[PDB]
Structures are given as structure tokens and as C-alpha cells.
Design an enzyme around this catalytic site. Structure first.
Site, PDB file in Angstrom:
ATOM      1  N   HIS A   1      -0.962  30.994  18.316  1.00  0.00           N
ATOM      2  CA  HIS A   1      -0.103  30.808  17.697  1.00  0.00           C
ATOM      3  C   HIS A   1      -0.967  29.990  16.436  1.00  0.00           C
ATOM      4  O   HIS A   1      -0.782  28.860  16.176  1.00  0.00           O
ATOM      5  CB  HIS A   1       1.079  31.739  17.253  1.00  0.00           C
TER       6      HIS A   1
ATOM      7  N   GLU B   1      -2.127  30.108  10.324  1.00  0.00           N
ATOM      8  CA  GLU B   1      -1.130  30.767   8.902  1.00  0.00           C
ATOM      9  C   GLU B   1      -1.471  29.150   8.324  1.00  0.00           C
ATOM     10  O   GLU B   1      -0.885  29.039   7.401  1.00  0.00           O
ATOM     11  CB  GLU B   1       0.318  30.905   9.302  1.00  0.00           C
TER      12      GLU B   1
ATOM     13  N   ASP C   1       4.629  41.918  14.699  1.00  0.00           N
ATOM     14  CA  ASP C   1       5.497  41.311  15.464  1.00  0.00           C
ATOM     15  C   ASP C   1       6.582  41.597  15.175  1.00  0.00           C
ATOM     16  O   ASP C   1       7.218  41.807  16.208  1.00  0.00           O
ATOM     17  CB  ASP C   1       5.067  40.605  13.709  1.00  0.00           C
TER      18      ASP C   1
ATOM     19  N   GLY D   1       5.729  29.015  17.858  1.00  0.00           N
ATOM     20  CA  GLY D   1       6.764  27.854  17.749  1.00  0.00           C
ATOM     21  C   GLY D   1       6.332  27.389  16.920  1.00  0.00           C
ATOM     22  O   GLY D   1       5.765  28.463  16.029  1.00  0.00           O
TER      23      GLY D   1
HETATM   24 MG   LIG Z   1       5.777  36.668  16.044  1.00  0.00          MG
END
Ligand SMILES: [Mg+2]
Ligand SMILES: Nc1ncnc2c1ncn2[C@@H]1O[C@H](COP(=O)(O)OP(=O)(O)OP(=O)(O)O)[C@@H](O)[C@H]1O
Ligand SMILES: [Mg+2]
Lengths: 598, 598
Positions: free
Chosen positions: A446, A449, A531, A418
Site C-alpha cells: 500500500h 496515497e 476497501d 499500515g
Molecule cells: Mg484498505
């Protein structure tokens, strides 16, 4: 049960071996030289007397008898090729050695103990029967004796030589290649190296079954080149991170996706987002925004209806199988597709996805083709402001989905993807997942990044996230790398996605270097992924191609270790993991052994 | 080099086989049936023409030829016995196939494949000379052909059967043993092939055994037997649950550690633990109270002296090396062995032990011997009778021990060992346990030994424990099986210790079966350890050999997989893990190569 007999100067040995076993045989086959002395009439009529069996006669063309070393080696190579053509796929064949002179008898014995043989036996009769009626007379009085000289397992990996070539469409002397003799030199060199160099025999880890020819071994150790595309295309792969909502976004895929819809035209089929100049090798770095809007034509805007979703699933599965991917997981958002006014809840959407996936998998398996097992991941999308409670719903959905009981494709875990942010860090929602682990699910996350290392540490140690996502900047926190390594927490990396987002691989005015080589050297369990295949315009094979110049200095053994990590850091049951291990080992052995030749 | 050749009707095969080696040949021995057609006079004269060549003639007494099964395996017995008698001490023999019908041909070529021959070959003459005058010109014109199929190493070590099984040249098969040991290996290999389970083998670890001879590969797949105990005194092993204090509890070892004390007046030599009939294979279950009352002779009250501790750790290292163990982890309690009267703080004791282990490591490595790498784990017991503050102390000490850095022996984790009566399930000690993981230390747990397997969940999650202790009753919690298998959380367990404390099969009135086989089938990472060597009175090899009775049907692949799991779950650096696997693979390959009957 297949009978193999070498035909020399005696013919009744074939019937003797046939009716040797009281139960009989459903397959009998014979091999012989070019000896014109042998008459096939007696064996042919005897076989015709029992049509329920199958009889084949193989003649060694060009040589009726052995006269020199070249003649013997050519005969042995023809015998080896014929033998490998007669391997039963699952079991091993029975062999009789009572035919021929000592030479071909010893040759066939060595071939049997080399490639295996279900049972090796001699037949011998005192009366030396000549006429068929007294074959039966000897059976009635029992003067024909059957002696079994044991059952050897044989070399398990050598059998596979088959693929190398069943038959070279009538091999001739001018072009004859003793390739099974090259298999023999391979095994001899392997054993001699093992017994000779203590230091070299120390260094055998790698993915299992590393008995490849030394030529193949040091070819694998050689750094990978950009010209190895066909190799990895033939090489089976695994995709642990793929999004369902980003498959058909460019090219002709959208036309086929829209061509089948339970609705007929309530779908904007003409308007498309503007295309970015250059793809997937864009030399200008872009960050978000343009990424999802490129896929705006797909996603919630398209698969609201039923048949379009089924078409998308079928096309995605066909694309997966066409790339030789043995196993993969798909991240899909059910609530993003549900339609209440059409009586299509999120649970209905997930059930439809599961049903089409399992139907496709069963159909592929029933035809004994290369079928790709697929498991499903539900994504707890962090949509920020809108209806926080929806996140909880997703978790419940997961807990209620895998509990459906039956099916080969099953919801295997949840996701934390998200809008990543400092406020949206994994420590915010820590109170909800204390139940999802209690039901046997699996949790990924996730981060990295944009999030700080503290968020990653919290995700690892609070949610017990068995995997991560992207996470391209662990090099700045060596403690974080250490604690990730010792806990065996795999990291999913998308090479092309990061290549678009960030700048490496002599990017214009970008001095940053990809950390994959250092990541693998330190021992982190990297799983290479895709991805969004449609958005990034690249499958696993192209990711592995670009891995060459993106991280210069990577050998093919690194690719093999990456594959092993991918099949090791995937949420799957132990028994299924073991079957996948065995199948993957067999397939990699076959593909490398066939690729070395050319 | 020794040449072994067999002939039947033909007699001119042997001298032609002699000229196979251009340099010449030194000793030749021939075995043949009792057929009178064969003429020994010409061979005798031909070998008397070369006095430097030793000649011996052996005949199959009481068997002119073969005409049934019984004669065939009779001759097989004679041939194999004569063969095994005729091995040279170190050099593999030369064998030819020029003479004899298919029976002896197959027999001795199978023997060459099994026992190994330096050069197996074939001699065939175009003009089939029968006397010496012809074969002079036959070899001088190149008519005689020296067919060869290359090196046939076979099993490198298949000769100790000569010593273990006595040689008996003069006997019959009707008399007795024909192959026996050979009969055993052949029947057991066949039985295994009828019942082979890659499911429990695909898990082939240490990929070097994929190069073991085909006669060797299935050999380890057979169920283990007690007679293989010598073998399990050769494989390098791993011992992770090994308490330091329990190494010396009785025997001359206790006397040795007592004598090294600086002062002998304050040494309590008076106490003598009571013996239990049948130790270590106790005939009744013994409770924990009697269990640590048996070990009350030694412990902190005797190890307070510095010289006593030094002698104890040196003897522990020596005994551990004697067990051929390569990597080990020692659980020690510093605060227990510290007295403030002589300025003997706990940190000083830990430093002394660490320096002693480092010195022993360096001394063993300098002599290029089989050194045993050891790591240390501090013990954070339950801190009985309240006063939990010392808990923090121990943890703090561990941290300060971790950051010392330099050396070989290190502190890699802490322990939670002690009584469960306090119901210490994570949260009771979670008030301060969060900080340990930040420093990077590992954390095991010894919980669920006797209580409800519920706090094990918190130990896995709240404590983030990477390993578990005992937990034999884990079977009745499938929801815990699924998590612990998917989490890759290893479990340590000691067969002898659990058998003593709880009692297990095949003991009368104890219907409980040891769950090791089920645990391995489920895919758990199970580590067989020894707990306290002195208390149990049995080293790691005895604990491994007891599994044959404890868990019938356990294969040698199961033991090797246990060793692989022990390597995997050990708290070590990743590069150290590759080095350990690198050494273990070669050592295991050599042990398996020279494994048979020892
Ligand atoms: Mg992704
Ligand atoms: N877990 C799996 N995933 C994918 N395919 C599998 C799996 N298990 C079995 N198979 C299939 O079983 C089939 C067995 O094929 P087989 O043993 O005859 O080898 P082959 O025909 O020479 O080569 P190939 O493996 O390509 O079929 C394979 O084709 C494989 O696709
Ligand atoms: Mg203990």
C-alpha cells in the site's frame, strides 16, 4: 441420453429408434404437429411397458400441416424452442430423423447441426412394420436397419441461447416472436461482417468470446450510463481488496452482529460513533481520522469473542454472494483480534476464520448455487511504535498458515498496509521478506496515497510486490508508470474510498480529476475494489455506478476489461484461474445476452 | 451459378426448382440413384426448351436405392464426389431439397453445410403437379412455395480436396476410397469430441476463432501431424531468441556474405566446418564445444567489414520475412563486430545495424507488403578470461541506444548469454546491474542450462529478469515452478537447438521426454524460438513442426497458445501490443479459414 424424434405420418419409428441402440435409452421424447391423424395410444402403451424410461409428446398447437412460408417458419420456431427445452445440461441428445415428410426432416437436421446432437441416425425397415408383435419379429430377424450420418459438435455458444427463454408460456401467433431466428440473424451477421470488412475483422481482442450480436457489440461500445446498475448487479464481479474489520459499522448490521456472541453483554452494544452528515455521497472531503473512528464500533472492539466473529463472517459472505461476486479476497488482522486471557491466539483466530469460510463455501457449492470462492490475506499492519517484532510474527503466521495442507479457502498472500510514511516506506522492512517469497507466498503493498515515487519504486523492485494499493498520483512520474506497465503489476483502486478522501466528480471547489481513464488507456491493470464496504457504505456495484460520473467517458467494455484485470491480477493457481476464466466467460455471455433484450 | 438437385421417385421437382431464381438460371446438374421410376425424358425435353441452360444428368451406377448401411454410405461417397466435382471455381452453388426421400435429403444437406452453398432451399407444391401443363398454372397461382432457411456459407475454403485428392468419377466404394479425406475428418472430429479438453482449449486465444465454423473449431483441437507443415508456413509467428551472428554459417548464404566484403584478401575462405550425418536431425548429442566450433566459419572474424554486415542483416531480414514471421527480436553483440583500426567503434556498428533495419522496415511498408517488425537486444556476455569492465561498457551502450528514440527498430533490452562455467548467478554480475532497470530496459537471462537450478531464483529476483533462456531441467523444482508460473515470467526455448545439444526422444538411448506439454499444462509462458537459424539449418516453421515427434499429442490450439505467449512476453510498448494482436487475430483467422490441407 435423450432421444428426440420428429413425428410425421409414421408411429413405429419411435419404437424403432428406442430399441435401435442395444443398450437402450433412459429418455425418449417426440415432437409433432397438430395432426389429428396420430394416435398416442400405441406409443403410450409401449412406453408404459418400460416405465424405467420417460416419454414426452410435444404437439405444435395451432397448425396440423404446413401450407405457406408463415406456417413453415412458425413450425420451425416452435421446433427450435422445443429443441432448446430438451438439451441435456451436460451432454447432447440423440436424434432420429426417420419421421415426417422431407420438410420437417430437413428442418430437424438443420436444427441438430445448429444446436448440436450426440448422434443423428435414420431408421428404415423393408417390411414397413405395422403391428407391435412384428416390430419384435423384425428385431428378431433383423430387417430394421439403423444408419448413422455422423456426429457434429454443433455451435457451442448458440446452445446457450436457452436462457433467452425455454418456453414463453404457450406462445401464440398474435404475440409470436421468432427470437431464435434472431439468433440465426446474429450468427449470419457476425460471419458476414467477419468475411466482408477486413478492417473490422482486424479489431477483435477484448475478453474472450466476443461473438455477441452486433447490436450488443456497439451497445457495449456505447459509453456507460448511470442507469446500468441492474446490468452490473447481474454481472459477476471480483473484489481483490476488502477489509474484514469494516463490514458492520452502520445501520442494522451491528445489531445482528452483536445478537450472537459467545459472551452475552460484556459488549457495549448501545454506544456508537457519531455519523457524518451525508453518505456515501458526502460532498465534503475528509481525510483519515474520521474514517477509522466511524468503524471503531467494529474491529478490535467487537470481534474479540468467538461467535460474534462467526456471525460477522457469515454476514460478510452472504453480502458477497448477494452481490453476485464470483471471487473475492478478505484482508484480516489476526493479532488485532487474539485474546490471550481467553486462550484465543492469533493462529486460533485465523483457523476459525478459515474453517467457517470453507464450511460456508462447501455448503453453498453442494447446493449447486452461485458460490463465491474466497481466499484470505494476512495484513502485516505497521502499528509504528508498539513491538516491531510483531510484524515478523505476522510473516511467520502467514508462512505457517498456508502450510495447513487441506482446504478450499487458503491463505494466499501477505500485505504491507499500515501507517504509510516516509520513514515507514517499503525500503525499511526489506530484510525480512526474503523468506516469504521462498515459501511461494505473494506480497502486495500500500503506497502512493502519500508516499513518494521512490517508495513505490523500492516496493516494486525490492519486495517484488505483485500488486499495489490506491496509488492515485503515478501521472507525475511517467517512468514509474512505464515500469509498472511493462512488469504487469496490477493496481488496486477503491473508487468510493478515494472519493471520500479526495475530491473529484464536480466536487465543490475541487478541480482534480480521477486518473482511471488515463490509467486504463495507458494499459495499467486496474482492479476496482471496495476497501471497507461498511465504512464506505457501498459495494462493488455502487463503485461501478459512481465510476460513470467520476470518470466521464467510460464505456461498458472498459468495465469488462476492468473485470478481466481483476481476475488476472489475483493470486490464484493456474488451473483454478482457468476454471474461473471459463465460468466468468459463460456468465458474462449469458448476462449480456439476457440484458440486451430489455 | 450452378444448381445441384437430387431426385428419387418424383421427377417434377427439378423444373419447379428452376423457377426459384426470378431472373433465371444458367447451368443445372442433377444426381440421382439408379431407380428406374425417375423419368429423365421430361427433364431432358424441359431443358432442351431452354438451350442456354447447360444440362447434365448423373446417376448412381450400380445402386437403385438404399436398403442398408452399406448402400447409404455408398451413395454418400457418390454424392460427395459428384458434389466436389461440381463446385464452380469461385461462386458457391445453389441447392434444393424438393426431391428424394430422407436419405439423400440428409446427405446433400449435410454436404451443403460442409462444402458451403450460396442458397440452400426447398420447393413444395400445394397441388403436386406431375406434368408441365399443371405446374404452369401451379406457379402462376402461387401454389408453389419457395421455402428457404437463409444463407449457408459453411466452410468458405473446403475445396482444395478436389486438387489434393484426385477426382475419380467411375469407381465403387467396394472398389475403395469413398470419402477417405472426408472419412478422415469425420472420424477425427468424432474422436476429438469423445476426448475434448477445454482445460487445454478454454484457453482459446485470438477471440476471432470463436467465429470459425463448427467443423473447423475442433479440427485444430486434434493432435498435430507432420503433413500439416504447409499450414505452419502460413500462420504469422514470433521469433525472440534469434542471434544475429548465427544466421549465416554455411551454404550459399555464407558465399553471398563473403562476396559483399570490400576487400577479399582478408577473408578466410579456407575454413570449412565439418558435417554431421543426418543434419539437422542429428543422431547423437553434440556438446557445446563442438556446437560453436561448427559455427566458427562465420562470426565476428568475418563480419568486421561494413558491407559484409549490411549484406548479412539484409539477408537475415529477407529470410525472416520468407518465414512469414511478423515480429522478431535479434540478439547482437556490437563490441564483437567493432575494430578500432578503421574508426569502427561499437556504437557505430549498432547505429549502422539500427539504420539498416529501419530502412528495410520503411521500404517494406511503403510497398504495402508483409513487413516484419524487428527489435534489437545487445548481448552482455560473461566476458570470458576475466576483464569484466567491458560488461559495463555494453550496458552503458544499451542505455545510450535506448534514449535515441526516433525510428522503428529500437533497443528494448539486454541479454546475459554465454558459458556457465564462471557460475554467473546474478550476484556475480549484480555489482552494477541495478541501474539498468531504472532506465526502463528489459533484461532476459540464459542461465541454468547445465548447472544446479539455484541461481535461477536470484536471476528472477535479484536481476528482476522478465524472461528466461532454456532451463529444460526446470521440472525438478516445484518450488521454482510455483514462483515462475505465478510471476508470469516467460521462458524462451528452441526445440531444435535443445534437441541437438542435449538429445531427446524418440532417439534411442535417450529416455528424456520434452517438457513442452507439461509446461503448457502447468500454464507457463513458453516461447518456441530458433536460436541460430544458420547453425541449426532450420527456420521457425521446421522448429514448430518438429514438436509433433518431440511432444506427441500436441494440438493446434497448443501451437496457437505458444504464439499467443510469444506475443505476450515480448518486450514491446502496450499500444504496439494491441496493434500486433489486432493484426495477428485477422491473419490467424484467414489462415485457419484457408488452412485445410495447406
Ligand atoms: Mg484498505
Ligand atoms: N468457479 C465458480 N464460481 C461460481 N459458480 C460456479 C463456479 N463453477 C461452477 N459454478 C456454478 O455451476 C453452475 C452451472 O450452472 P448451469 O451450467 O446449469 O447454467 P445455468 O443454470 O443456466 O445458469 P447459472 O450459471 O446461473 O447456474 C452455475 O450455477 C455456477 O454457479
Ligand atoms: Mg542464445
Amino acid at each position: 441420453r435423450v432421444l428426440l424424434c420428429s413425428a410425421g405420418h409414421s408411429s413405429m419409428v419411435v419404437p424403432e429408434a428406442f430399441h435401435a441402440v442395444p443398450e437402450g435409452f433412459e429418455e425418449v421424447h417426440v415432437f409433432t404437429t397438430d395432426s389429428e391423424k396420430f394416435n398416442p395410444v400405441v406409443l403410450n402403451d409401449f412406453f408404459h411397458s418400460l416405465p424405467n424410461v420417460r416419454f414426452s409428446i410435444t404437439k405444435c398447437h395451432g397448425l396440423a400441416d404446413i401450407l405457406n412460408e408463415r406456417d413453415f417458419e412458425f413450425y420451425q420456431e416452435m421446433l427450435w424452442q422445443w429443441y432448446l427445452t430438451k438439451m441435456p445440461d451436460n451432454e447432447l441428445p440423440y436424434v432420429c430423423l426417420s419421421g415426417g415428410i422431407k420438410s420437417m426432416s430437413a428442418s430437424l437436421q438443420k436444427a441438430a447441426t445448429l444446436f448440436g446432437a450426440q448422434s443423428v441416425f435414420h431408421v428404415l425397415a423393408d417390411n414397413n412394420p405395422r403391428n407391435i408383435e412384428e416390430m419384435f419379429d423384425a428385431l428378431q430377424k433383423g430387417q430394421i436397419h439403423f444408419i448413422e450420418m455422423g456426429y457434429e459438435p454443433g455451435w457451442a455458444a448458440l446452445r446457450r441461447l436457452k436462457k433467452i427463454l425455454p418456453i414463453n408460456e404457450g406462445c401464440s401467433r398474435d404475440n409470436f416472436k421468432p427470437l431464435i431466428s434472431k439468433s440465426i440473424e446474429e450468427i449470419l451477421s457476425n460471419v458476414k461482417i467477419m468475411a466482408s470488412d477486413t478492417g473490422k475483422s482486424n479489431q477483435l481482442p477484448f475478453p474472450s468470446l466476443a461473438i455477441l450480436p452486433p447490436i450488443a457489440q456497439q451497445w457495449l461500445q456505447l459509453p456507460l450510463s448511470a442507469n446500468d446498475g441492474a446490468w452490473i448487479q447481474n454481472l459477476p464481479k471480483v473484489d481483490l481488496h476488502c477489509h474484514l474489520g469494516g463490514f458492520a459499522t452502520s445501520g442494522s448490521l451491528l445489531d445482528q452482529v452483536r445478537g450472537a456472541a459467545s459472551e452475552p453483554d460484556l459488549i457495549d452494544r448501545t454506544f456508537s460513533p457519531q455519523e457524518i452528515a451525508g453518505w456515501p455521497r458526502s460532498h465534503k472531503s475528509i481525510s483519515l481520522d474520521k474514517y477509522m473512528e466511524l468503524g471503531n464500533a467494529n474491529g478490535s472492539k467487537l470481534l474479540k469473542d468467538k461467535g460474534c466473529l462467526i456471525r460477522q463472517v457469515e454476514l460478510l459472505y452472504q453480502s458477497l454472494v448477494n452481490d453476485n461476486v464470483a471471487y473475492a479476497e478478505i484482508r484480516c488482522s489476526p493479532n488485532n483480534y487474539a485474546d490471550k486471557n481467553k486462550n484465543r491466539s492469533a493462529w486460533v483466530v485465523l483457523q476459525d476464520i478459515n474453517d467457517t469460510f470453507t464450511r460456508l463455501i462447501t455448503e453453498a457449492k453442494q447446493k449447486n448455487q452461485f458460490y463465491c470462492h474466497v481466499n484470505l490475506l494476512v495484513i502485516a499492519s505497521r502499528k509504528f511504535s508498539g513491538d516491531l517484532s510483531d510484524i515478523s510474527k505476522h510473516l511467520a503466521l502467514a508462512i505457517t498458515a498456508m502450510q495447513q495442507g487441506e482446504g478450499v479457502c487458503r491463505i494466499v498472500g501477505v500485505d504491507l498496509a499500515g501507517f504509510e510514511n516516509k520513514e515507514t516506506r517499503a525500503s525499511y522492512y526489506e530484510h525480512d521478506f526474503k523468506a516469504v517469497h521462498r515459501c511461494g507466498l505473494a506480497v502486495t503493498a500500500h503506497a502512493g496515497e502519500n508516499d513518494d515515487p521512490e517508495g513505490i519504486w523500492q516496493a516494486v523492485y525490492s519486495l517484488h510486490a505483485r500488486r499495489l494499493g490506491h496509488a492515485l498520483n503515478l501521472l507525475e512520474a511517467p517512468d514509474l508508470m512505464r515500469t509498472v506497465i511493462e512488469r504487469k503489476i496490477g493496481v488496486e483502486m477503491c473508487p468510493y474510498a478515494n472519493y471520500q478522501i479526495k475530491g473529484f466528480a464536480p466536487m465543490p471547489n475541487f478541480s482534480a480529476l480521477y486518473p482511471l481513464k488515463k490509467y486504463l488507456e495507458a494499459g495499467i491493470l486496474v482492479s476496482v475494489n471496495t476497501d471497507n464496504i461498511g465504512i464506505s457504505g457501498a459495494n462493488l456495484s455502487e463503485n461501478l455506478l459512481i465510476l460513470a460520473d467520476l470518470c466521464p467517458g467510460i464505456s461498458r467494455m472498459d468495465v469488462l476489461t476492468i473485470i478481466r484485470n481483476s481476475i488476472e491480477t489475483a493470486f490464484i493457481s493456474h488451473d483454478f484461474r482457468m476454471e474461473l476464466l471459463k465460468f466468468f466467460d459463460r456468465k458474462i455471455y449469458d448476462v449480456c445476452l439476457i440484458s440486451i433484450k430489455n
